[PDB]
Design a protein around this ligand. Structure first.
Ligand SMILES: *[C@@H]1O[C@H](CO)[C@@H](O[C@@H]2O[C@H](CO)[C@@H](O[C@@H]3O[C@H](CO)[C@@H](O)[C@H](O[C@H]4O[C@H](CO)[C@@H](O)[C@H](O)[C@@H]4O)[C@@H]3O)[C@H](O)[C@H]2NC(C)=O)[C@H](O)[C@H]1NC(C)=O
Ligand SMILES: *[C@@H]1O[C@H](CO)[C@@H](O[C@@H]2O[C@H](CO)[C@@H](O[C@@H]3O[C@H](CO)[C@@H](O)[C@H](O[C@H]4O[C@H](CO)[C@@H](O)[C@H](O)[C@@H]4O)[C@@H]3O)[C@H](O)[C@H]2NC(C)=O)[C@H](O)[C@H]1NC(C)=O
Ligand SMILES: *[C@@H]1O[C@H](CO)[C@@H](O[C@@H]2O[C@H](CO)[C@@H](O[C@@H]3O[C@H](CO)[C@@H](O)[C@H](O)[C@@H]3O)[C@H](O)[C@H]2NC(C)=O)[C@H](O)[C@H]1NC(C)=O
Ligand SMILES: *[C@@H]1O[C@H](CO)[C@@H](O[C@@H]2O[C@H](CO)[C@@H](O[C@@H]3O[C@H](CO)[C@@H](O)[C@H](O)[C@@H]3O)[C@H](O)[C@H]2NC(C)=O)[C@H](O)[C@H]1NC(C)=O
Ligand SMILES: *[C@@H]1O[C@H](CO)[C@@H](O[C@@H]2O[C@H](CO)[C@@H](O)[C@H](O)[C@H]2NC(C)=O)[C@H](O)[C@H]1NC(C)=O
Ligand SMILES: *[C@@H]1O[C@H](CO)[C@@H](O[C@@H]2O[C@H](CO)[C@@H](O)[C@H](O)[C@H]2NC(C)=O)[C@H](O)[C@H]1NC(C)=O
Ligand SMILES: *[C@@H]1O[C@H](CO)[C@@H](O[C@@H]2O[C@H](CO)[C@@H](O)[C@H](O)[C@H]2NC(C)=O)[C@H](O)[C@H]1NC(C)=O
Ligand SMILES: *[C@@H]1O[C@H](CO)[C@@H](O[C@@H]2O[C@H](CO)[C@@H](O)[C@H](O)[C@H]2NC(C)=O)[C@H](O)[C@H]1NC(C)=O
Ligand SMILES: *[C@@H]1O[C@H](CO)[C@@H](O[C@@H]2O[C@H](CO)[C@@H](O)[C@H](O)[C@H]2NC(C)=O)[C@H](O)[C@H]1NC(C)=O
Ligand SMILES: *[C@@H]1O[C@H](CO)[C@@H](O[C@@H]2O[C@H](CO)[C@@H](O)[C@H](O)[C@H]2NC(C)=O)[C@H](O)[C@H]1NC(C)=O
Ligand SMILES: *[C@@H]1O[C@H](CO)[C@@H](O)[C@H](O)[C@H]1NC(C)=O
Ligand SMILES: *[C@@H]1O[C@H](CO)[C@@H](O)[C@H](O)[C@H]1NC(C)=O
Ligand SMILES: *[C@@H]1O[C@H](CO)[C@@H](O)[C@H](O)[C@H]1NC(C)=O
Ligand SMILES: *[C@@H]1O[C@H](CO)[C@@H](O)[C@H](O)[C@H]1NC(C)=O
Ligand SMILES: [Ca+2]
Ligand SMILES: [Ca+2]
Ligand SMILES: [Cl-]
Ligand SMILES: [Cl-]
Ligand SMILES: [Zn+2]
Ligand SMILES: [Zn+2]
Ligand SMILES: [Zn+2]
Ligand SMILES: [Zn+2]
Lengths: 690, 690
């Protein structure tokens, strides 16, 4: 039989290892020749593997690179203007790669140019609440200061936005060993920790879903009309640069001014973590000077798009996509994901050569420029939005397959909860001590859900990866899965560093490639069921359940302000009523789906498919037109985290500080109305159609 | 057989006459008890007629009414402040209706309150070009003046917007016999002309598709959050009032200042048509004073929604809709349309009782508050937007069935051109002298297309009726048809007057009700074919042909500025390329549709259905978010007229007067890009799906 078991059994750990090795010998930075070459290789191999068509889709997008002849760095400068300390020009390359060229030095992609000079202020993680604490409680003014913040907790774009709004004239990001050095583990190459010369690359945009900064709404094709730089979406207005903790120590050790307000502000270096501003008495005429010379440049990018045409519903698309561009070697990010996609394509192609086709069409994507703002996935989705709108069943992401070796992590729409539970009960656990047990059992045991005994945790989708356009813009059911760490005890230490290599993975994360194989089975299995099950494998009742949980949550937030709720007649009745209705209607739809003819089948599959779609508001969320999903948006404070009923949540956030409470509570009521309406309207898509 | 011929033959002129009589004995003003009663009657009758379900859908929307105890009127006032001339308080009621109550006196719905006093300026039709002529050429400043404009040429909302932007402090609208008195015809009741005491009612909003001014985007349901009045959509900021030509003469006869610039500014009254400002020497200390006391009030409205469930594709909706609210009796507008819908429902119900069902679902709508801004249709569509988006095959409007007795008028999407041609060849002409000939033949002979010999004229859809939300917001294929006048020789004279009665229609327009019957056959036939044909009856190649015509047209407009096109590198190449591609892809799709299994059939019907949909841009047109169709929008200068490639057209309009030509030509290029992309993207929806 050509069934899921055939598909699953053909996947091999040894192939994934070979592919990873193949993809990680040289850097594959977006817009560079080497990443174009790798695109061509993947296209040719996907064809050999048996896909029906494999094309490159290219776009010309805004990218950012350092200037090779004018390096970025930071100084401490004395009152004579002599540069007495300079940060590093590059990360010490790892063993045996000391002669690889084209390693991009650490930089913050899309930083403007500048050489600002000033006194430091230390802002902890540069979160919204860190700035609140500084300005409201400690009375420290960031205006015209250079801020230094530790990476961690939130997306670095949010940090930079927050620093900017606080008046900073530049930002220095660093990795504190408190967040990037696990106790008892050695620094690379002898372990998986970050060495003191290691540095995390990454873009600092605030795109809010826009894609290419120059072409929001429309693909960056050959005739596209581009905004001028000054009207581009999401660019920072102050210079930014990242450093390692050897260099951070030299910048922090002289800091004076106020003490840290408490221990949640102190990392692990041997410095006081004084907030500043400026240095202690002896050094108080010294200053910090940034030198940033990076340029933004419109550059061509290449997605690979493979199609395996469906036998019965070729106009229904199940998408497996993940990116191929890396900051340097991409040992984990993204090639541990891309290698898993490559083996999935290989396996599907094996069945296809023996005469099998999936029921529905499967699209396979190798995205470019993910690292620079999800640009490849977003431009292609803008291009194909109509097709995706009307035909898109589901999107399964496939970035990094591992960020730990402890258990499974799944983040997805509630519509896939039942699919994930069922599939994982059929897969073998790769974990030591659960030999002969199911992946469900090990996962549930290591990562129990907070709500329900005997079920595992599944998180809401956040952002900061290539499902964003599909889920939060277009409303296509989406999911992701990877192996992760124990989150009792920020992401893996070597993230976006030169040290993220093949050897890292092979020696320290997954020497047997069994975690990779488990993740290939989960991602591939999901795709298989989505593309082959007669009835789409979504359970609308799972949405009803979380909608009630989120409504309770948002209500409880508002209920912190009982007096204002009375004064302004702020009621959540409508939202609860809509949730109640969605619950009843969903339950009736499920009975019909169980008890119901290909037209009847197509009608009900269309109702399943369009259910995620129904949570889209074509007017978008306030000032974020590309975040259109009413239930889920990336947190306005942290693009990695998802927020539920984001419209209401943001209308409530910090509301006690607004100067016109009537206006602010008005807007809470407006968002309640929009949310209740959208829920009711989604529910009604599951009613009998006539 | 239950086929189209059975459906068509069951329609009777005599039933339509009876229904019209029934619907026109008392006024049915939106939001009044009598229009609610009539809603209930229609619901009960549609049930008796056999529909599967018939519901009322209500909304609470902003309406406008005069104050019964504080009448609106205009004066000429002398320097002592005595009111020496007053306009009428009401239209002299027609014979035998002199005791009907609840006739709303003439007023401009949604006028703010005020009593401005000032000098008159006469602004002809108050078109954009009339204001250009006054300000740029004649050097006449409207600021702080009361303007008087004749109705005609453009939607009265546009006139008021234009007066406002010119600085007017109030507007007086009147009906000039030049535009509302046909030569050799008697005034009502002895003919169909407008008497001098007759007055055209009508709203003066500029909603741009928003619906209820208080709830743009969302239905005005029981929990809706409403904007405050000051943030409402589309309300005028200066008082406005309409008058008849006896009263206009008294206001125009004393006018001095400049002569009319030419004869296109002179109507037919015995006055000079001086532009002003102000009155001639003797009367130069006299002034004009408005007294407007109307109130805007949130008021409940009621749509009737009837469903005839489809036997095979119940999740596909063919909609026949038209409004039921009238300004007074609604003899023509809308009851000549509503009576035709009522008989269509009756006929479909006859077949249904004998065991027939259409293939697809047919929805029947009696809309409320059309007269106040398309409010009923728009609120229901906002409510049901998701269902309509994914399931809406087509919308057939059904307002006034007649505005003349000369030939057929059809305005529709190009996707319905072939359907209309074919259907009309099968219908009998009702016209004198074409006995035994087809309606196609009489129509083509009386109204030849300007492009093609042997085909009839079919116009683009404009707006100012209830298809607006369906077509320009949601992208559902739409059409309308009615009997019309000879347009060699503005709309019918008695439009929106108390004199628009049953007797008007029966005595002067259609004594045999044969034109009504012909229009019922055309509208009903269209619905029948849309709802019953196995393959949707749309020809995508007809779109290809008009797209080329529109691209040529817009190019020719730009080519009036050859130097700027060179300087700014303004190319239409991309748009022509996209049109070319759409032509090729459409032609290949048609061959497959001819040469191709219910899934394959559903796939291709979905491609047909989603083709109109593909011209929607979810970002909307600039500053008009509810006009989302890229090919067609209502003219920014005249809501009744359609404009093609509206985004480009508006970017080019009056471009030689813009102060930053670089910026203005930039925006022309941006719109070219958006249009080319959208055309290409629509074309690609007709490519093989995988
Ligand atoms: C969840 O689904 C339920 C359906 O089971 C749905 O219930 C509906 O609630 C609306 C809103 O409350 C009801 O609206 C009423 O309709 C009647 C006519 O049928 C009107 O007369 C009512 O208006 C009067 O009373 C109001 C309330 O005090 C006054 O404000 C008003 O001025 C009038 O006096 C009122 O509009 C509706 O009938 C039911 N529908 C059904 C099918 O029962 C509920 O709304 C759904 N939740 C959401 C969020 O959609
Ligand atoms: C109508 O459909 C046709 C398909 O039959 C489609 O033609 C396409 O046109 C695009 C845009 O011109 C072509 O784009 C090129 O693609 C190649 C790779 O295949 C690139 O190398 C080209 O870029 C180079 O040259 C440019 C032009 O001078 C430079 O600006 C650039 O810097 C590079 O040097 C270029 O991007 C494309 O290949 C064809 N596609 C096909 C399938 O032939 C046309 O675009 C459609 N019209 C619209 C409006 O969509
Ligand atoms: C995940 O797996 C579960 C457990 O198998 C699936 O739920 C089961 O689905 C089956 C097939 O529809 C249900 O069977 C039906 O039983 C009813 C009456 O009990 C009968 O009317 C039908 O004809 C049919 O035999 C079964 O009840 C149901 N079990 C439970 C506990 O819900 C679930 O569907 C799977 N989810 C996905 C997304 O595949
Ligand atoms: C309006 O009526 C016209 C004229 O009847 C319809 O066009 C005709 O459609 C038929 C049915 O598809 C076409 O028949 C086909 O002929 C081809 C080869 O010539 C053959 O491959 C098919 O199997 C089939 O027999 C016919 O060619 C075509 N005639 C013309 C002149 O186009 C048209 O479809 C109608 N439009 C609508 C919207 O219904
Ligand atoms: C990654 O794998 C590919 C394919 O197995 C290698 O690329 C091939 O190289 C061979 C030998 O040089 C050529 O003859 C082929 O034309 C290439 N094939 C394709 C499809 O590109 C590639 O060299 C490997 N890269 C590394 C670093 O191991
Ligand atoms: C990268 O930095 C270099 C080196 O300092 C820049 O090149 C100089 O540009 C100036 C002014 O345009 C010239 O007069 C110098 O001769 C250039 N120096 C050299 C060494 O060629 C260069 O412009 C920067 N590159 C980018 C892309 O911005
Ligand atoms: C930090 O780097 C700067 C720039 O390379 C060094 O300062 C330069 O030193 C050279 C040689 O002494 C001078 O001719 C340049 O004029 C200096 N440039 C600037 C901008 O100051 C500095 O020595 C380095 N500092 C340390 C401690 O190594
Ligand atoms: C319009 O037609 C309807 C229906 O034929 C008339 O309303 C009916 O009136 C009869 C007699 O008074 C009642 O017993 C029915 O209950 C009514 N039916 C419905 C469905 O409402 C109505 O009177 C007619 N109106 C006029 C002005 O002729
Ligand atoms: C319609 O106009 C009337 C009549 O001039 C308004 O009624 C007056 O309102 C004032 C102030 O509110 C009272 O002191 C008067 O006694 C009222 N006059 C009468 C005759 O009752 C009335 O407010 C207006 N109606 C609306 C809806 O605006
Ligand atoms: C036009 O109407 C106004 C208002 O009804 C008339 O002026 C009023 O006349 C009465 C009785 O003479 C006075 O007590 C009111 O004070 C007047 N009101 C105002 C606002 O002026 C006027 O006579 C009418 N003019 C004509 C020519 O009929
Ligand atoms: C922060 O400092 C700047 C300039 O020195 C000033 O304009 C701004 O008001 C300051 N805000 C404070 C102290 O709250
Ligand atoms: C792999 O698992 C072991 C066993 O728990 C753990 O000690 C080690 O830290 C893990 N490796 C990585 C990179 O997490
Ligand atoms: C029109 O008149 C007003 C006020 O009397 C003035 O402010 C405005 O500039 C005028 N414009 C002209 C004469 O162009
Ligand atoms: C009806 O048609 C006749 C014949 O052409 C024409 O003279 C008359 O004006 C028409 N009636 C109306 C209301 O148009
Ligand atoms: Ca773009
Ligand atoms: Ca609304
Ligand atoms: Cl992922
Ligand atoms: Cl109409
Ligand atoms: Zn990644
Ligand atoms: Zn990354
Ligand atoms: Zn009407
Ligand atoms: Zn009307």
């Amino acid at each position: 039989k050509h069934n899921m078991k055939a598909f699953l059994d053909e996947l091999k750990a040894e192939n994934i290892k070979k592919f990873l090795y193949n993809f990680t010998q040289i850097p594959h930075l977006a817009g560079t020749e080497q990443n174009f070459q790798l695109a061509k290789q993947i296209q040719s191999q996907w064809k050999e593997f048996g896909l029906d068509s494999v094309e490159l889709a290219h776009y010309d997008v805004l990218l950012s690179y350092p200037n090779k002849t004018h390096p970025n760095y930071i100084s401490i400068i004395n009152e004579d203007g002599n540069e007495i300390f300079n940060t590093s020009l590059f990360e010490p390359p790892p063993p045996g790669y000391e002669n690889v060229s084209d390693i991009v030095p650490p930089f913050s992609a899309f930083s403007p140019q500048g050489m600002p000079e000033g006194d430091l202020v230390y802002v902890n993680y540069a979160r919204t609440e860190d700035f609140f604490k500084l300005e409201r409680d400690m009375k420290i003014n960031c205006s015209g200061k250079i801020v230094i913040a530790r990476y961690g907790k939130v997306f670095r774009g949010n940090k930079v936005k927050n620093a900017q709004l606080a008046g900073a004239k530049g930002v220095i990001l660093y990795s504190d060993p408190a967040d990037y050095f696990a106790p008892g583990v050695k620094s690379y190459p002898d372990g998986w920790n970050l060495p003191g010369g290691g540095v995390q690359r990454g873009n600092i945009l605030n795109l809010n879903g826009a894609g290419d900064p120059l072409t929001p709404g429309y693909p960056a094709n050959e005739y596209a009309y581009r905004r001028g730089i000054a009207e581009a979406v999401g660019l920072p207005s102050i210079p930014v640069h990242p450093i390692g903790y050897y260099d951070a120590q030299k910048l922090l050790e002289k800091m004076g001014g106020s003490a840290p307000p408490d221990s949640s502000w102190r990392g692990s270096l041997k410095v006081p973590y004084n907030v500043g501003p400026g240095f202690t008495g002896n050094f108080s005429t010294q200053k910090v000077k940034m030198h940033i010379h990076s340029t933004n440049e419109v550059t061509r990018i290449y997605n690979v798009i493979g199609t395996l045409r469906g036998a019965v519903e070729p106009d229904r698309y199940v998408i497996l996509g993940g990116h191929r561009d890396s900051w340097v070697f991409g040992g984990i990010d993204p090639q541990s994901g891309a290698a898993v996609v490559h083996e999935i394509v290989r396996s599907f192609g094996t069945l296809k050569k023996e005469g099998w086709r999936p029921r529905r069409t499967i699209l396979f994507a190798s995205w470019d420029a993910e690292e620079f703002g999800l640009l490849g996935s977003t431009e292609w989705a803008e291009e194909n939005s109509r097709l995706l709108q009307e035909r898109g069943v589901a999107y399964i992401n496939a970035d990094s397959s591992i960020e730990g070796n402890y258990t499974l992590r799944v983040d997805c729409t509630p519509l896939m909860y039942s699919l994930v539970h069922n599939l994982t009960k059929e897969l073998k656990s790769p974990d030591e001590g659960f030999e002969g047990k199911s992946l469900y059992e090990s996962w549930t045991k290591k990562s129990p859900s907070p709500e329900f005994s005997g079920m595992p945790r599944i998180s809401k989708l956040g952002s900061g990866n290539d499902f964003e356009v599909f889920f939060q813009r277009l409303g296509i059911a989406s999911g992701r899965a990877r192996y992760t760490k124990n989150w009792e005890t920020s992401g893996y230490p070597l993230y976006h560093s030169v040290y993220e290599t093949y050897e890292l993975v092979e020696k320290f994360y997954d020497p047997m490639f069994k975690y990779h194989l488990t993740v290939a089975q989960v991602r591939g299995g999901m795709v298989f069921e989505l593309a082959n099950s007669i009835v789409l494998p979504f359970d609308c009742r799972d949405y009803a359940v979380v909608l009630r949980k989120y409504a309770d949550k948002i209500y409880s937030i508002s209920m912190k302000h009982p007096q204002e709720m009375k004064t302004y007649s702020v009621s959540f009745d409508s939202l609860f009523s809509a949730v109640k209705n969605f619950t009843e209607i969903a339950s009736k739809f499920s009975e019909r789906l169980q008890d119901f003819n290909p037209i009847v089948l197509r009608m009900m599959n269309d109702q399943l498919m369009f259910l995620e779609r129904a949570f889209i508001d074509p007017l978008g969320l306030p000032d974020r037109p590309f975040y259109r999903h009413v239930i889920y948006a990336p947190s306005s404070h942290n693009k990695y985290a998802g927020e539920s009923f984001p419209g209401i949540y943001d209308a409530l956030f910090d509301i006690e500080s607004k100067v016109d409470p009537s206006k602010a509570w008005g807007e809470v009521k407006r968002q309640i109305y929009v949310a209740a309406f959208t829920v009711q309207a989604a529910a009604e898509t599951l009613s009998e159609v006539a």
